[PDB]
Amino acid sequence: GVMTVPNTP
Amino acid sequence: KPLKGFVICCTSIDLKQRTEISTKATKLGAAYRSDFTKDVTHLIAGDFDTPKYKFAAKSRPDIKIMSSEWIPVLYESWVQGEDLDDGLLVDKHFLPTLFKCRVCLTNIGQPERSRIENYVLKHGGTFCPDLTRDVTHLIAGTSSGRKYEYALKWKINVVCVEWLWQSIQRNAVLEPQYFQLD
C-alpha cells in the first residue's frame, strides 16, 4: 500500500 | 582462430542474441556450449539471477563472466581487419560485478551509508535510497524497521553488508542465503 519506503531521514 | 581454446556458454541471453553470439564465437575459433559443461571458460551473462550464473560464482570462480557485448565487439574488430590485442578485449568486457543489482540500505548510519553507495556505483550496480519493489538487495543493519518489513512483503533479499564486500572481492554477485542476518 505504498509505492516506496522512503530513505530514513 | 583468436578464440582457439575458448569455450563459451550463455545465461539470460535472448535467443536471437544467443544465435549471434554462438555463431560469431565459433567463427572466431571458440567452442560453444548449451549446457554448462566442465570445459566452459567464459560465461556470457545477461543477469545474475540464473542457475548457470549461481553455479559459476559458487563452484567455478576460474570461469570469466562476460557481458553480452564482448563477442559482437571482438568479432567486428576482427573482421574489420584490426590487429587483436592478445587479451582479445576480455578485460574490457567483464560483466560489471554488481550488474543489475539495485541495492537499498537500512539501519546503518553515516558515513557508512555514503561509502556503501560509493562502492555500489563503482562496481556497476544501482544505489536506491528508497525501497521499491524492484530493489534486489536490502543491506540491513538489523532485522527490524519499515524498509525491512516491506522487503519481506516484497520478497526482496535481505543481506548483511558482507554480501557487498565479498561480492566486490569476488567480481560476482554472491547468493543471499550466505549473508542472512542472525
Numbering used by the authors:
A (entry chain B): 106 to 114
B (entry chain A): 5 to 186
Please, what does the article write about this entry?
TOPBP1 and its fission and budding yeast orthologues Rad4 and Dpb11, respectively, are scaffold proteins that mediate formation of multi-protein complexes in a range of essential DNA replication and repair processes. Bioinformatic analysis suggests that only three of the BRCT domains in the yeast TOPBP1 homologues, and four in the vertebrate TOPBP1 homologues, possess the required cluster of residues needed to bind phosphorylated peptide motifs. Despite the structural similarity of these phosphopeptide-binding BRCT domains, genetic and biochemical studies show that they are nonetheless selective and specific for the phosphopeptide sequences with which they interact. To gain some insight into this, we have determined crystal structures of segments of yeast and vertebrate TOPBP1 that contain the two most N-terminal phosphopeptide binding sites (BRCT1 and BRCT2), in complex with phosphopeptides derived from a number of different known ligand proteins, including RAD9, and used this to develop consensus patterns that encapsulate the individual specificity requirements of these two independent binding sites.
Mbd1 is the S. pombe orthologue of the metazoan DNA damage mediator protein MDC1 and plays important roles in the DNA damage response. To try and identify other potential phosphorylation sites on Mdb1 that might mediate its interaction with Rad4, we searched the Mdb1 sequence using ScanProsite as before and identified a good match to the motifs defined above, centred at a documented site of phosphorylation on Thr113. The sequence around Mdb1-Thr113 matches the TP/SP proline-directed kinase consensus and hydrophobic −3 residue seen for many TOPBP1/Rad4 BRCT1 and/or BRCT2 interacting sites. However, based on the presence of a polar residue, threonine at −4 our model would suggest that this site would not display high-affinity for BRCT1. We found that the Mbd1-pT113 peptide bound to Rad4-BRCT1,2 with low micromolar affinity but showed no binding to Rad4-BRCT3,4, the equivalent of TOPBP1-BRCT4,5 that has been implicated in mediating MDC1 interactions in the metazoan system. To determine which BRCT domains mediate the interaction with Mdb1-pT133, we measured binding to Rad4-BRCT1,2 with mutations in BRCT1 (K56E) or BRCT2 (K155E), and found binding was substantially reduced compared to wild-type with the BRCT2 mutant, but was largely unaffected by mutation of BRCT1. Based on these observations, we were able to obtain a high-resolution crystal structure of Rad4-BRCT1,2 in complex with the Mdb1-pT113 peptide, confirming the preference for binding to BRCT2. The structure shows the Mdb1 peptide bound in a very similar conformation as Crb2-pT187, Crb2-pT235 and Sld3-pT650 peptides bound to this domain, with the valine at −3 relative to the phospho-threonine packed into the hydrophobic recess, while the polar threonine at −4 that makes the sequence incompatible with BRCT1, is directed out to solvent by the β-sheet conformation of the peptide backbone.
